[PDB]
mmCIF file of C-alpha atoms and ligand atoms in Angstrom:
data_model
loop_
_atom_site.group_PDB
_atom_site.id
_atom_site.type_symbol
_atom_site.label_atom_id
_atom_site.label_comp_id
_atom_site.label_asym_id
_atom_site.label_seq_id
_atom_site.Cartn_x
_atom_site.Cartn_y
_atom_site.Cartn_z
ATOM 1 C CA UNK C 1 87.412 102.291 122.599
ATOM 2 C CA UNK C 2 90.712 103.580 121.255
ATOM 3 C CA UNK C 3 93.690 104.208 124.133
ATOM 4 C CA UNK C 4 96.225 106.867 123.352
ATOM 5 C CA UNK C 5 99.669 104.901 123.370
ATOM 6 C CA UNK C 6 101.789 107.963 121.983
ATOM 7 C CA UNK C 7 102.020 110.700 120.512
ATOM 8 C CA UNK C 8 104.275 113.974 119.482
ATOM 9 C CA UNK C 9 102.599 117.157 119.823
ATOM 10 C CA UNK C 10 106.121 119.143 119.196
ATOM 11 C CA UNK C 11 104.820 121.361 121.654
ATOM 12 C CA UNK C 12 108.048 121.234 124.023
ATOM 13 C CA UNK C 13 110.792 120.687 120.889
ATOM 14 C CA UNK C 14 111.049 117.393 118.794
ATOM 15 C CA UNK C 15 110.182 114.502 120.891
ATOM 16 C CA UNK C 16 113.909 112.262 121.990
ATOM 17 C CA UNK C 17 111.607 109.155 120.309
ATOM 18 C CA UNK C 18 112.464 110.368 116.862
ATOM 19 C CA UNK C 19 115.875 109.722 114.836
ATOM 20 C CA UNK C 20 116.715 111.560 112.194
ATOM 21 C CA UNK C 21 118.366 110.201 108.903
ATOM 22 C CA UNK C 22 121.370 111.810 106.959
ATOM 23 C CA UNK C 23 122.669 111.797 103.372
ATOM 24 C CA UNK C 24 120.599 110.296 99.810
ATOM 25 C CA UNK C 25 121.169 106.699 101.147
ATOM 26 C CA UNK C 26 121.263 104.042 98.869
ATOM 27 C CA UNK C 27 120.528 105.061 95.210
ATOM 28 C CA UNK C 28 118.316 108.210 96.446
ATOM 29 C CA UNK C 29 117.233 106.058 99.377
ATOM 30 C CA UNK C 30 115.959 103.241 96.545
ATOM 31 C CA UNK C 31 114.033 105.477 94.564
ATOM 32 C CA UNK C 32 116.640 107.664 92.829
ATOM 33 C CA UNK C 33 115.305 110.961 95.428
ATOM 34 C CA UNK C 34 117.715 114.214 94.790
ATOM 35 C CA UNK C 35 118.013 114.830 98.712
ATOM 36 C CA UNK C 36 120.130 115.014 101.292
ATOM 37 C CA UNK C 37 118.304 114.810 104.585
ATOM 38 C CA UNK C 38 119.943 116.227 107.608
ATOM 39 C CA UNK C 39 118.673 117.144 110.997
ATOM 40 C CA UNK C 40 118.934 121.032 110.289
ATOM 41 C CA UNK C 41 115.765 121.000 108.044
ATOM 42 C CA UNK C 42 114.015 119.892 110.882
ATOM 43 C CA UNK C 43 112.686 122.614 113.455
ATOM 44 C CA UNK C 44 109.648 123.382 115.757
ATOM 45 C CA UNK C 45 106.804 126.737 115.144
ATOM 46 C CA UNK C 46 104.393 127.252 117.184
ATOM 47 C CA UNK C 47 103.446 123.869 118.318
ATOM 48 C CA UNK C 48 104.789 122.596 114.790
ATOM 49 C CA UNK C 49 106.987 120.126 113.490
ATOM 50 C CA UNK C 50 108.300 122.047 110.089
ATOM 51 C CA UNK C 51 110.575 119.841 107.630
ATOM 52 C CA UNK C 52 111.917 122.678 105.188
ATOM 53 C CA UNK C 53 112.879 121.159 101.614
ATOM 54 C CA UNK C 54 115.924 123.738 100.431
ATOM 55 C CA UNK C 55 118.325 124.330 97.096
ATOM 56 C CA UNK C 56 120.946 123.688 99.206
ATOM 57 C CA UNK C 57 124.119 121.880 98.479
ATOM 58 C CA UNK C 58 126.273 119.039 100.561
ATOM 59 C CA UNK C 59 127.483 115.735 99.724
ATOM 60 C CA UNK C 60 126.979 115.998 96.039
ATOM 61 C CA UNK C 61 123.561 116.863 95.670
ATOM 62 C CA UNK C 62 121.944 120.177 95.248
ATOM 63 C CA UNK C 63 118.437 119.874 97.834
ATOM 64 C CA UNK C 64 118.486 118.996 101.674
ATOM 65 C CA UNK C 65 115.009 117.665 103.698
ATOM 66 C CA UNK C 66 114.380 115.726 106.415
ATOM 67 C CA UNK C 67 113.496 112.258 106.999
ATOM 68 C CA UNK C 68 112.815 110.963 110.684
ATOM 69 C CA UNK C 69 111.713 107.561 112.092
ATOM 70 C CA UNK C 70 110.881 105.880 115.666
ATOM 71 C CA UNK C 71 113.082 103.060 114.861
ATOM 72 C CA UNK C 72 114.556 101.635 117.407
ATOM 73 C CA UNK C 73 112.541 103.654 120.026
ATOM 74 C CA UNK C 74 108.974 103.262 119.686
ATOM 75 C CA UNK C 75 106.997 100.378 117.463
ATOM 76 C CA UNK C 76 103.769 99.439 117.510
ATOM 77 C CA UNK C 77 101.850 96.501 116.258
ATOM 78 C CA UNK C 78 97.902 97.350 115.660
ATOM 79 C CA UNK C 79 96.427 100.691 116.270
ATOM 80 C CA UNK C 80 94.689 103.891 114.453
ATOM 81 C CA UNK C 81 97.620 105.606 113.628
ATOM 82 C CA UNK C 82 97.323 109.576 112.804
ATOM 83 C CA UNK C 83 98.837 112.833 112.420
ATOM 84 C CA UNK C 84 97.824 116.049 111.174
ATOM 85 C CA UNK C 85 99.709 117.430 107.743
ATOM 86 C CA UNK C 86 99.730 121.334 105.735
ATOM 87 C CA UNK C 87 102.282 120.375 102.893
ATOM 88 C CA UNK C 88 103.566 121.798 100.103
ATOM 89 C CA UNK C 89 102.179 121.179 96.490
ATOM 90 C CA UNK C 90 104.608 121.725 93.523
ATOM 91 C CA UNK C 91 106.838 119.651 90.728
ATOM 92 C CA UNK C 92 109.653 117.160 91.898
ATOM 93 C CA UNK C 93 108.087 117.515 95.865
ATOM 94 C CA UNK C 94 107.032 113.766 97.638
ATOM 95 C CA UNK C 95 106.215 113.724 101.113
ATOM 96 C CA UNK C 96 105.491 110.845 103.010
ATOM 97 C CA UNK C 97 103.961 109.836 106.335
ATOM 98 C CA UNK C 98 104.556 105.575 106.360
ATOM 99 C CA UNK C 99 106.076 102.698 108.210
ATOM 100 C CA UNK C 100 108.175 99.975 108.170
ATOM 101 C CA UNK C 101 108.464 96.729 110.176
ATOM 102 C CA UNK C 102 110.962 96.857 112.907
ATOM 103 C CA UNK C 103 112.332 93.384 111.245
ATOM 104 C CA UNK C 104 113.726 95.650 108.385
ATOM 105 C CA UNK C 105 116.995 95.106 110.059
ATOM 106 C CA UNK C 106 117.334 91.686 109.572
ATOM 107 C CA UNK C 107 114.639 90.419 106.176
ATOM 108 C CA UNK C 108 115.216 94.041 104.237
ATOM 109 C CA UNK C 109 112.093 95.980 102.690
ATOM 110 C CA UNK C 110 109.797 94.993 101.160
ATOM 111 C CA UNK C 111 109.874 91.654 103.339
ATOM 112 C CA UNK C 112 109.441 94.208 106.381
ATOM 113 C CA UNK C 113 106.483 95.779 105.041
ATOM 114 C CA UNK C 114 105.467 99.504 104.551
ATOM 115 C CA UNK C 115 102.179 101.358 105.820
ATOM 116 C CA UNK C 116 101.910 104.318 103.713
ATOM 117 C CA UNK C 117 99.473 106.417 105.624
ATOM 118 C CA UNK C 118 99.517 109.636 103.169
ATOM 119 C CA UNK C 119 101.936 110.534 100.342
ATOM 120 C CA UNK C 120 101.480 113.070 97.526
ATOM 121 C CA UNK C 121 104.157 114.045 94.374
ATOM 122 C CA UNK C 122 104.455 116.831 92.475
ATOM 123 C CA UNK C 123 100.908 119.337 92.200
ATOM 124 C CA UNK C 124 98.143 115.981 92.276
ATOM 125 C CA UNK C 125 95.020 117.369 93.493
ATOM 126 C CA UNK C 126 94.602 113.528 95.716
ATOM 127 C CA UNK C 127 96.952 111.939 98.080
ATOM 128 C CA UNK C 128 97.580 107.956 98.362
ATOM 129 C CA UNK C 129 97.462 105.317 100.729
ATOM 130 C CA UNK C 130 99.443 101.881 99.952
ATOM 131 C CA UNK C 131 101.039 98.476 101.711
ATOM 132 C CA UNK C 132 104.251 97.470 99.959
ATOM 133 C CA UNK C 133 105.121 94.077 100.936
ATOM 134 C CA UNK C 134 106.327 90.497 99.621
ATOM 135 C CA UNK C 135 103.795 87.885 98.358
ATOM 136 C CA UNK C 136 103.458 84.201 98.783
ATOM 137 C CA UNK C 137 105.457 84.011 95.681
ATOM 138 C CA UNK C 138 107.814 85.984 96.780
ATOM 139 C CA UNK C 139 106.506 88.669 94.325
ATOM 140 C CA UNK C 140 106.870 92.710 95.357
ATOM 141 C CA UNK C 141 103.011 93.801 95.646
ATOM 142 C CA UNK C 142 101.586 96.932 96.413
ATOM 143 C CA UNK C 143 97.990 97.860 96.589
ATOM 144 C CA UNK C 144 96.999 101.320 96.634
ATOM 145 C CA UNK C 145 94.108 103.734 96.810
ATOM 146 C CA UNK C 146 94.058 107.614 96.261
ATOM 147 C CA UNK C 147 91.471 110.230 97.563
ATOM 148 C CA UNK C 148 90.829 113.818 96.171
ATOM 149 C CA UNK C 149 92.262 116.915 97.968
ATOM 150 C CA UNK C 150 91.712 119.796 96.693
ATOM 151 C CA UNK C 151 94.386 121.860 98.987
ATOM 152 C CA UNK C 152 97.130 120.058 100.482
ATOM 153 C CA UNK C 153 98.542 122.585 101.612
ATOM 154 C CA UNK C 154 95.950 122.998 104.284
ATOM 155 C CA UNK C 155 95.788 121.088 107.377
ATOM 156 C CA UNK C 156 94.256 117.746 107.051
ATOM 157 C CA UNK C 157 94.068 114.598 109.085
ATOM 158 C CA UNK C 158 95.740 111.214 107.871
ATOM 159 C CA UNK C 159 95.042 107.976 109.690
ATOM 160 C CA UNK C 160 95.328 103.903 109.179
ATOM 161 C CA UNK C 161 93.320 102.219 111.341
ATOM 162 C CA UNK C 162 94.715 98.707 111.649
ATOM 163 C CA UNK C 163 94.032 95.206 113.070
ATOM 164 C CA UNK C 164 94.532 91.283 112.544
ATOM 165 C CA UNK C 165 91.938 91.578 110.407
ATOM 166 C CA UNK C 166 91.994 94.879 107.534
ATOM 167 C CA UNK C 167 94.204 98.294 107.653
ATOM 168 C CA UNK C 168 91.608 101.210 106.511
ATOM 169 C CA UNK C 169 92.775 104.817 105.108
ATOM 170 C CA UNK C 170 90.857 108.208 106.264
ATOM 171 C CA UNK C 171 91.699 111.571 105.193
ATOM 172 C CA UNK C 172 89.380 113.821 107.417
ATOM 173 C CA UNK C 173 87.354 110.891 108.935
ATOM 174 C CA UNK C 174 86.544 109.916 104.977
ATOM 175 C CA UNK C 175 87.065 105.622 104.333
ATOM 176 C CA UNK C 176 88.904 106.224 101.087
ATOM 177 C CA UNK C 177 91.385 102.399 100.785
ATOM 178 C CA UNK C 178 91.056 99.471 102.812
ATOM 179 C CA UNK C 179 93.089 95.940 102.724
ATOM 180 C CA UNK C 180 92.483 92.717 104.229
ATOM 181 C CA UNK C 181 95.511 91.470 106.036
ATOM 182 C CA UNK C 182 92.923 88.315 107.679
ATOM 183 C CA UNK C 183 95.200 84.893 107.450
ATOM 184 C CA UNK C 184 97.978 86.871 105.640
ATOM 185 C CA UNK C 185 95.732 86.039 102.668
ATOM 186 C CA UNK C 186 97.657 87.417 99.594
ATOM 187 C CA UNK C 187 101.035 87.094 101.553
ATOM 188 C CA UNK C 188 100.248 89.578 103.337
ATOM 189 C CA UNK C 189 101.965 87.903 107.068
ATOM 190 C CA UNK C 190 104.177 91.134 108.023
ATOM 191 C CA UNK C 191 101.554 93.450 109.104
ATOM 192 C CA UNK C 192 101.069 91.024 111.920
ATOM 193 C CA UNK C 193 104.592 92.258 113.281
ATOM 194 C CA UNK C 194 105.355 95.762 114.723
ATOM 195 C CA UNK C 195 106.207 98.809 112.764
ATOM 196 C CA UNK C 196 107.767 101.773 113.461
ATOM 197 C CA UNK C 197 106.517 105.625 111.925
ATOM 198 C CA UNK C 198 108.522 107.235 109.399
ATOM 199 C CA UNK C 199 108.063 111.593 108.131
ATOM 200 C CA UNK C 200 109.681 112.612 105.308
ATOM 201 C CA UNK C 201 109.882 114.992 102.350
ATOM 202 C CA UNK C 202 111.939 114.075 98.981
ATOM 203 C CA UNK C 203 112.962 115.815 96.426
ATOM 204 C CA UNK C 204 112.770 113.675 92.751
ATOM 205 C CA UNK C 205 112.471 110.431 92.376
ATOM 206 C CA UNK C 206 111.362 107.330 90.425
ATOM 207 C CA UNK C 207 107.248 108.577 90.891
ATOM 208 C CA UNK C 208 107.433 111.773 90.793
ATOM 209 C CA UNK C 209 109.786 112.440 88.653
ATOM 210 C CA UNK C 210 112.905 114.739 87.498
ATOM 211 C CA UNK C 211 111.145 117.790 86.796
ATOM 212 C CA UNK C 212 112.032 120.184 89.786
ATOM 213 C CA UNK C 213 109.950 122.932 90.053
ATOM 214 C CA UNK C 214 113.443 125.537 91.820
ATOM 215 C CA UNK C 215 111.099 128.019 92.507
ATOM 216 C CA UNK C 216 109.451 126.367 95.106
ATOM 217 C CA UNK C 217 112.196 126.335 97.323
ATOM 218 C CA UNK C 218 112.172 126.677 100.420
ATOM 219 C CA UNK C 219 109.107 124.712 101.141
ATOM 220 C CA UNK C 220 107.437 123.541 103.942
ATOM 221 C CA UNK C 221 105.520 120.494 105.315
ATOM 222 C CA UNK C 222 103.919 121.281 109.121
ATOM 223 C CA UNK C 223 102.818 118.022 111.274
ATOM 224 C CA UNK C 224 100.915 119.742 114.029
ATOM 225 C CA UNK C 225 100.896 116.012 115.816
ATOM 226 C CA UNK C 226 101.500 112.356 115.128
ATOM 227 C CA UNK C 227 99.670 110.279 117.860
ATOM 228 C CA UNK C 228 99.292 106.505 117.864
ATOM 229 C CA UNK C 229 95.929 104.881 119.492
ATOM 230 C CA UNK C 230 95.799 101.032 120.437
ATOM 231 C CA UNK C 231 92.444 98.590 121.687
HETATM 232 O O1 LIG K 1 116.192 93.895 92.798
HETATM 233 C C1 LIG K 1 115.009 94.354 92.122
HETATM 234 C C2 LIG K 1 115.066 95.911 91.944
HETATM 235 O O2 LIG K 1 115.771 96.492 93.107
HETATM 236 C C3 LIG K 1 115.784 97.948 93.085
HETATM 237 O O3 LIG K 1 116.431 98.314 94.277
HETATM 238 C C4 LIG K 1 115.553 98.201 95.448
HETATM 239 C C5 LIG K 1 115.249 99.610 95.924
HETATM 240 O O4 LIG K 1 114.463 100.216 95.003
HETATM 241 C C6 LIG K 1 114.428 99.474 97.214
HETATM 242 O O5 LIG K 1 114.188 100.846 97.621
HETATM 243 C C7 LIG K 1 113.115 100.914 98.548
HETATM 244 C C8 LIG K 1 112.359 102.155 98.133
HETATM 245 O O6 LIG K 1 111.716 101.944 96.910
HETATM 246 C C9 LIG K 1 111.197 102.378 99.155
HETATM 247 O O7 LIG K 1 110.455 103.603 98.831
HETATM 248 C C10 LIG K 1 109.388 103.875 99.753
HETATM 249 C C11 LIG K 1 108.109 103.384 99.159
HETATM 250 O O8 LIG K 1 108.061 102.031 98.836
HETATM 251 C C12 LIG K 1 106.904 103.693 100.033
HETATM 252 O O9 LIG K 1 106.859 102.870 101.201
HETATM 253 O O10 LIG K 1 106.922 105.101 100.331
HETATM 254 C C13 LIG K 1 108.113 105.581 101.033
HETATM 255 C C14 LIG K 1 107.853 107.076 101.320
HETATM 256 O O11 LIG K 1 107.606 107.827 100.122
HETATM 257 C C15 LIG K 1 109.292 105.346 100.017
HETATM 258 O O12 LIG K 1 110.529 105.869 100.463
HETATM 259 O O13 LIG K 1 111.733 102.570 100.462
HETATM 260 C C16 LIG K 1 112.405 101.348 100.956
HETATM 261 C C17 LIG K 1 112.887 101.718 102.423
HETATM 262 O O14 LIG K 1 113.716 102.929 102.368
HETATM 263 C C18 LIG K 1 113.606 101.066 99.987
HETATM 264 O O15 LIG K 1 114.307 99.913 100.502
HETATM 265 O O16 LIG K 1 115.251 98.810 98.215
HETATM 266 C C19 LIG K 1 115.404 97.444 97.795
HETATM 267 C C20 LIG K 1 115.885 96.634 99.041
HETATM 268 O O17 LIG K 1 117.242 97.072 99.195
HETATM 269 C C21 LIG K 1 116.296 97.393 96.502
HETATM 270 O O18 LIG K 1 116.454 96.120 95.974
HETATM 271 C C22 LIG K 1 116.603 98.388 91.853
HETATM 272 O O19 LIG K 1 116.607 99.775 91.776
HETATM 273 C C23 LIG K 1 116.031 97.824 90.595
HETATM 274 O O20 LIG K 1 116.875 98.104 89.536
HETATM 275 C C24 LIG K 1 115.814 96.354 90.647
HETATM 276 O O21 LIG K 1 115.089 95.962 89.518
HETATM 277 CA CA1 CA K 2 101.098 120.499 117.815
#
């Protein structure tokens, strides 16, 4: 059976395991995002984590968001992995619910590997779930599968289970991606390390694009939990 290892209800506040990032980092954190994240965007409703995407300006750029992580706190290697997302749904919007190896640090993504347990851009009527990683050549790969959603904006549940052997996608309970990680066949040795959770919502970017819808603003994403389940 599965074993709850951890988990943030944000019944009591944002849970002290989370860090929050600041600024558009490197090149719109490598993707060329329009955001600055800052802790303010972040806040608690009713049980709720809310991340607020704003027309809001600091730093040079014109949107603020948040993005949080467990680095450095809490990582986990193996496990179902879950949390429960409402988010918005209009043009230039990308949230994310993903992880990265702890060893980012030291080898740099993609070496480190990403988990991307949901993301959706823009008003897609499907959200995606996709490893980034390096190959045995070397060679940036991703492999990624999509599922239809017809409202995002309701609640709905997003989970990886993972193992030595295969990561799996679910949205709702539904098997919609799966990848073999067995023998790190396709170079795929980095998802045998730990990884830490990341939440996010950017503005822009290389995927979804540079058409902002500015109407849209503010907008919200709600997490109701994130838990984390081991064997
Ligand atoms: O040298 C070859 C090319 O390098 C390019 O610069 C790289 C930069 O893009 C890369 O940025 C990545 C960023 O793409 C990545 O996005 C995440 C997704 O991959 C996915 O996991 O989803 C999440 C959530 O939506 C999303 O943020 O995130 C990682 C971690 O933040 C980030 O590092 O970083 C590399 C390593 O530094 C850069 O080399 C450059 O633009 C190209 O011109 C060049 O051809
Ligand atoms: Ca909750």
């Amino acid at each position: 059976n599965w074993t709850l290892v951890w988990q943030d209800e944000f019944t009591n506040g944002i849970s002290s395991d989370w860090v929050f990032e600041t600024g558009n980092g490197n090149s719109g954190w490598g993707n060329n995002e329009l955001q600055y994240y800052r802790r303010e965007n972040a806040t608690v409703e009713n049980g709720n984590l809310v991340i607020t995407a704003k027309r809001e300006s600091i730093g040079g750029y014109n949107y603020t968001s948040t993005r949080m992580k467990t680095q450095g706190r809490k990582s986990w290697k193996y496990g179902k992995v879950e949390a429960r997302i409402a988010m918005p749904s209009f043009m230039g919007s990308w949230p994310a619910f993903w992880m990265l190896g702890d060893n980012i640090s030291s080898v740099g993504w993609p070496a480190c590997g990403a988990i991307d347990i949901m993301e959706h851009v823009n008003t897609e009527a499907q959200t995606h779930g996709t490893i980034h990683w390096q190959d045995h050549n070397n060679t940036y790969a991703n492999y990624s599968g999509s599922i239809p959603v017809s409202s995002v904006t309701s609640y709905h549940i997003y989970t990886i289970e993972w193992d030595a052997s295969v990561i799996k996608w679910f949205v709702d309970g539904n098997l919609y991606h799966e990848a073999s990680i067995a023998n790190g066949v396709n170079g795929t040795s980095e998802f045998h390390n730990n990884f830490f959770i990341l939440l996010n919502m950017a503005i822009g970017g290389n995927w979804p694009g540079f058409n902002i819808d500015n109407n849209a603003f503010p907008a919200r994403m709600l997490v109701d939990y994130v838990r984390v389940y081991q064997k």
